Amino acid sequence: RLIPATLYPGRVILSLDFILFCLRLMHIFTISKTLGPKIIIVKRMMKDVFFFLFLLAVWVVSFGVAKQAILIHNERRVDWLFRGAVYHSYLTIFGFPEWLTVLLLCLYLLFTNILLLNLLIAMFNYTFQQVQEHTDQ
Amino acid sequence: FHSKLQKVLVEDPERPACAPAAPRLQMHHVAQVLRELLGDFTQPLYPRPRHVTFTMDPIRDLLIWAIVQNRRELAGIIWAQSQDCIAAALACSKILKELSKEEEDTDSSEEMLALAEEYEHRAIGVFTECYRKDEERAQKLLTRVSEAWGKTTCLQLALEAKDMKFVSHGGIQAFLTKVWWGQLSVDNGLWRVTLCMLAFPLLLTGLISFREKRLQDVGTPAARARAFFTAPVVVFHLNILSYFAFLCLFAYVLMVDFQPVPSWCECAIYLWLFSLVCEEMRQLFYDPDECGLMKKAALYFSDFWNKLDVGAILLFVAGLTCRLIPATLYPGRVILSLDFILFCLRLMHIFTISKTLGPKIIIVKRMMKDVFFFLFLLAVWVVSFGVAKQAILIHNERRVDWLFRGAVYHSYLTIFGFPEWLTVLLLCLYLLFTNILLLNLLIAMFNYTFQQVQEHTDQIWKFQRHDLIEEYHGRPAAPPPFILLSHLQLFIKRVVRHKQLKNKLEKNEEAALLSWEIYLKENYLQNRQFQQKQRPEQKIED
């Protein structure tokens, strides 16, 4: 920001820095009589959920680009196309050619809200049962 | 055993050629049936012909003839005096597990099987000791070439007879890993691999580690980087990148460079896909033993993961020619798109070797079979719901290309996680079934199946870990870019093992080794029977 030729990127950077700080607040619940243990657990979990996050990412992005490819001949401009597509992906991630359309939609929804859901379901339950007892120490 | 022997006796051609009245039970027949029982990879334990004389290690011969007849006490006695106990115990485990399949009697089969696993406990028992004393020599033991048991090795017999408890001993896992890192150190983390892989001078720098500092301290960076490249861990990471790039590039060229004539890049990845599947097939014939071709075929046909890959191949060879015909260009686009996504799936494979997740994938691999079935039901569920909507809110409609499209999209939004009274009733019932019934259902489904397997899989994973290591240690060091020169360097010999997993030893060396083991086996024996003296039930009997 100090360099005026770098003012707008200064804005976006310092925004990031803000959010980073806001994270550090979970620290409250460290001393939490009643939750500290939990944070301990997720602290053990941070390492793997990161790795898994990667996969779901490439997952949806492959899906979206498949969409763009099948519904068009040629496109560009990821600043509105990929922006609106990533936003629609955020909505989907909050939780007679028509036959081709139905097939695409069904397969996509098959993978997105199912495979990875049950996956993490198992992941948490398993790792949970790995440590659920003695951390309080 | 006796029945089988009679058969193979009269099955002999040369004996009824000699005298059809006196079939001379000839020793090597026994060898033959044994080779069948033991495996195709060993040798015939007794030679074929064409003052007394023992053979090498008579005691083993006694040991077999006692085993096949399921004589527990006799066996236990003799084995205590065997020569190289580890291999012995294993071979016995293998035979017994084999013979316990085709016995057609219950009580005897059960008794057999139990005996078998009892021996693998013996094997573990000796080895855990011999390792607890020394490590390096203990490793040297897992991979010698037992001339007695048909020139095979202990580790093989382990894998053949499926001795999870053995291979998962943990000292073994230490050994495997020690190969995983190939030449260099085994404690350097893994980020250092990635970074130093990027920049060459990082290798010439002091950021990475090495074992046997005679090459670490004394630095000949040329062969140093060479040795580094030999480390299959790396060769793995090369493959993982090349794969990454191939995939996304393929996405690019289909996106923009899509051209009816074969674009420079389209033909490029065509050659690439061929290169990849070429190495794939290459891993079918390295079989050093006379491995059955239809057998390994049924194996790959059994590998669900191999099943995925081959499905994707069929997709390609289909869609390629589809696009190739210009009258089938647009459907060529949609097909090859599918093929893309299929490939992108195969990437979860990363987490197979995942120190920290592989087990999980194992689980979901067990789950794939049922979630599929359930997916069906939710599908028809929502679709019934949507069509009920369309029916109740209209008199007549058509055109599923916008109607069913927008309806299926609204269904995707719903699946991401005074007539008005009729409207409220419809909405309430629908939401009742959709986000509730099936949710709690799968909730139970996962929790139940989870509790069905949540404990011991780690074994299975530890077991699997091997063959992967075997492969990437075996494959020649050439990622798919420079893999074609390797493929042709292969086909030149196609037209005209390693010392890592199998190595003869020297009489002077081997002898000292065997004596060393003999000693420790005796030690193990004492501790066993002694701790037997403490079992309270036994004390009361006293």
UniProtKB/Swiss-Prot annotation, chain B:
Cytoplasmic side: 207-232, 286-304, 355-366, 443-477
Impact when changing residue 355 to A: Decreases in sensitivity to PIP2
Post-translational modification: Phosphorylation of TRPM2 at Thr-177 by protein kinase C (PKC) counteracts the effect of cytosolic Ca(2+) and elevates the temperature threshold.
Tissue note: Highly expressed in brain and peripheral blood cells, such as neutrophils. Also detected in bone marrow, spleen, heart, liver and lung. Isoform 2 is found in neutrophil granulocytes.
Consequence of substituting residue 395 to A: No effect on channel activity
Family affiliation: Belongs to the transient receptor (TC 1.A.4) family. LTrpC subfamily. TRPM2 sub-subfamily.
Protein name: Transient receptor potential cation channel subfamily M member 2
Gene: TRPM2
Residues of the full protein shown: 532 to 1150 of 1503
